[PDB]
């Protein structure tokens, strides 16, 4: 019901764009019919867990008016961020060479899709953020400080991938003037704290939040300093079991995982080299991140030696505690906020 | 003098963002230190052409010293928004393009220590960095909204003339992602035109006008229909100019080799050349175009020769130069202050 009227928002928001590049961009039907594709593969086929996650916020919050215009800007919200992030991973995708997203093939990866143009269609995705709110929001109030707290998150994702990207070779041998290197320098839990938070929490949970608050005027009334708090939590917790079940969770899990083939700076790899013995390490820098099947059946026993699902175990409970008691502080100002957060929560709790 | 403080200006703007990142994005002096050469390498070295004009047309709209020296300062910060725009476009362009160098120097995805997967999301940090610093300088003027929104406009605007430039390949009715991809279908004038006039007129020419009207608060005194048209016009022309001087102006005089036609462009002497030329002109130069032997581009040269492409210029040329000073005078007499600033763009145009 949320995603029917989702859905149906997303036909009013695309139908809008490319009328508005034919009346006003000179577009033809041929171009137009492609960028239409591009949104459709682009943007749709996901869960749409952060767009309706801004409705239930706002549908917490809450004379028939003020309802139905609250939760049509609540939708035209979600679908920026569905936009936004379509937007990094279409790029992400070409920044990785991966091959396919979603069962289906990536978006570069397309026949009739080259990587030159494939690069600027992200573009465009991220563009159509700022031309929907521009239009549906014109007349609201919120519209310069929605904008800015958006430009801020958009900023925040991508400083996010540069922390990714970086996380491969010691960081003092950074220097665009000099050739580059695989080693592990970077592999430390504050490290990966601090990709996580940026490249994820902020997009995926925080913003959804506030875009719910700004749409049913309420931001006033929620004490922001907790909520942040809150949404890092939880943006946190939501890639330490994803990589806690990419080892140990079996295929169950809906896919083999890969992340130690792909020498990933996962929870498990940082938490275990923080703790492992010199020999132990050794024995990991070795095997760790190829292709063959003993290798990686090499660290799988390191992992399960060095009980990091056991540290896991002491991890969640201890974050599913500090989330518990934040969430109480929101209960108490914000009981309609504090209950979407609880929502919000519990799509990624033990999953 | 301009320049002295446009520059001036830049530290500050550089200064604050590396220390944004550092005190509130929890970033290492190792990697704020990429980001600076990141930073330098890819928004330094051009002329600045796109800066200067905004300061410029708020200085001529200047017509205590507080208000002066604020106004000023806003044109910078607005200058530089349009200049990191640009730089993020040239980044993931010269990626998208397979270039080589630009500006002398290597691309930046092509520099030793940079890869293509970090060069794309560098270049999302370049057009980010232009909202930070409009949000940050301009965090209490009214204007502030409005400037975005315009801004935000353009950059779609830019990125739509993009999708046009790269689709000038092959029909577009083969266009399909579905489907794989093989035309000189799409070279026509009107195709021409509209890839210059969202690619390029919009930012290089509107945006720095419009800018530096927002931050003289002078938005509501000048004709917008007439600026608009002016700035299509003349970002029209620069292309045009170019496209004729790539083929035609030597290499002493031009300061490289022109290889439009090696390079299979679109050009406004391929689509004008198309439009008028006979069947047999059209089959030798589909025969012979786009190709880097020697030969073969000297016959195209010869094409255009005889299809006197020069004269269609020269009449090309002589045609906006009078409507553009029409424009201008009609802007002159409610906005005379505007109006010589555009004069002056027009002037930095309108040769060499
Ligand atoms: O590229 P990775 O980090 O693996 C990924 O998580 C995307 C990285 C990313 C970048 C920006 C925003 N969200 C995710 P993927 O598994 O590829 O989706
Ligand atoms: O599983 P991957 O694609 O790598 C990932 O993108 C999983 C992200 C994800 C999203 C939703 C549900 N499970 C995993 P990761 O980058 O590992 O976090
Ligand atoms: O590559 P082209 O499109 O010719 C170029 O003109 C790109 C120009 C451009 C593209 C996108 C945005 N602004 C300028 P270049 O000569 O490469 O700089
Ligand atoms: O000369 P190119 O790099 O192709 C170009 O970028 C011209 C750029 C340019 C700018 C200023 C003066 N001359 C040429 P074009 O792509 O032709 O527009
Ligand atoms: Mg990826
Ligand atoms: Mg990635
Ligand atoms: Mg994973
Ligand atoms: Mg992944
Ligand atoms: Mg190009
Ligand atoms: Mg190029
Ligand atoms: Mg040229
Ligand atoms: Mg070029």
């Given at each position: 019901?949320?995603?029917?009227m989702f859905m149906q928002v997303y036909?009013?928001?695309?139908?809008?764009?490319?009328?508005?590049?034919?009346?006003?961009?000179?577009?033809?039907?041929?171009?137009?019919?492609?960028?239409?594709?591009?949104?459709?593969?682009?943007?749709?086929?996901?869960?749409?867990?952060?767009?309706?996650?801004?409705?239930?916020?706002?549908?917490?919050?809450?004379?028939?008016?003020?309802?139905?215009?609250?939760?049509?800007?609540?939708?035209?919200?979600?679908?920026?961020?569905?936009?936004?992030?379509?937007?990094?991973?279409?790029?992400?995708?070409?920044?990785?060479?991966?091959?396919?997203?979603?069962?289906?093939?990536?978006?570069?990866?397309?026949?009739?899709?080259?990587?030159?143009?494939?690069?600027?269609?992200?573009?465009?995705?991220?563009?159509?953020?700022?031309?929907?709110?521009?239009?549906?929001?014109?007349?609201?109030?919120?519209?310069?400080?929605?904008?800015?707290?958006?430009?801020?998150?958009?900023?925040?994702?991508?400083?996010?991938?540069?922390?990714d990207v970086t996380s491969m070779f010691?960081?003092?041998?950074?220097?665009?003037?000099?050739?580059?290197?695989?080693?592990?320098?970077?592999?430390?839990?504050?490290?990966?704290?601090?990709?996580?938070?940026?490249?994820?929490?902020?997009?995926?949970?925080?913003?959804?939040?506030?875009?719910?608050?700004?749409?049913?005027?309420?931001?006033?009334?929620?004490?922001?300093?907790?909520?942040?708090?809150?949404?890092?939590?939880?943006?946190?917790?939501?890639?330490?079991?994803?990589?806690?079940?990419?080892?140990?969770?079996?295929?169950?899990?809906?896919?083999?995982?890969?992340?130690?083939?792909?020498?990933?700076?996962?929870?498990?790899?940082?938490?275990?080299?923080?703790?492992?013995?010199?020999?132990?390490?050794?024995?990991?820098?070795?095997?760790?991140?190829?292709?063959?099947?003993?290798?990686?059946?090499?660290?799988?026993?390191?992992?399960?030696?060095?009980?990091?699902?056991?540290?896991?175990?002491?991890?969640?409970?201890?974050?599913?505690?500090?989330?518990?008691?934040?969430?109480?502080?929101?209960?108490?100002?914000?009981?309609?906020?504090?209950?979407?957060?609880?929502?919000?929560?519990?799509?990624?709790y033990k999953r």
């Amino acid at each position: 019901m949320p995603m029917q009227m989702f859905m149906q928002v997303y036909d009013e928001i695309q139908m809008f764009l490319l009328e508005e590049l034919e009346l006003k961009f000179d577009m033809d039907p041929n171009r137009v019919r492609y960028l239409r594709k591009m949104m459709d593969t682009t943007c749709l086929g996901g869960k749409y867990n952060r767009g309706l996650t801004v409705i239930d916020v706002a549908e917490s919050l809450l004379d028939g008016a003020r309802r139905k215009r609250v939760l049509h800007d609540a939708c035209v919200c979600g679908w920026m961020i569905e936009f936004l992030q379509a937007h990094y991973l279409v790029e992400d995708d070409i920044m990785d060479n991966s091959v396919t997203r979603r069962g289906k093939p990536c978006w570069y990866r397309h026949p009739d899709v080259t990587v030159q143009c494939a690069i600027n269609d992200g573009l465009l995705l991220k563009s159509w953020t700022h031309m929907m709110a521009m239009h549906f929001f014109a007349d609201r109030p919120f519209l310069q400080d929605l904008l800015c707290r958006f430009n801020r998150v958009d900023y925040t994702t991508a400083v996010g991938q540069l922390y990714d990207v970086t996380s491969m070779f010691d960081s003092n041998k950074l220097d665009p003037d000099v050739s580059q290197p695989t080693d592990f320098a970077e592999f430390t839990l504050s490290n990966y704290k601090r990709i996580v938070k940026y490249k994820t929490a902020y997009y995926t949970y925080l913003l959804p939040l506030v875009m719910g608050l700004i749409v049913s005027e309420a931001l006033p009334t929620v004490d922001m300093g907790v909520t942040e708090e809150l949404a890092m939590l939880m943006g946190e917790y939501f890639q330490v079991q994803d990589d806690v079940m990419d080892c140990f969770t079996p295929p169950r899990l809906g896919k083999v995982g890969t992340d130690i083939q792909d020498a990933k700076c996962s929870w498990l790899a940082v938490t275990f080299l923080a703790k492992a013995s010199s020999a132990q390490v050794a024995e990991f820098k070795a095997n760790y991140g190829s292709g063959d099947s003993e290798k990686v059946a090499t660290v799988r026993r390191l992992y399960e030696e060095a009980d990091l699902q056991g540290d896991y175990v002491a991890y969640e409970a201890a974050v599913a505690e500090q989330v518990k008691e934040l969430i109480e502080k929101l209960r108490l100002c914000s009981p309609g906020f504090a209950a979407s957060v609880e929502t919000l929560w519990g799509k990624t709790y033990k999953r």
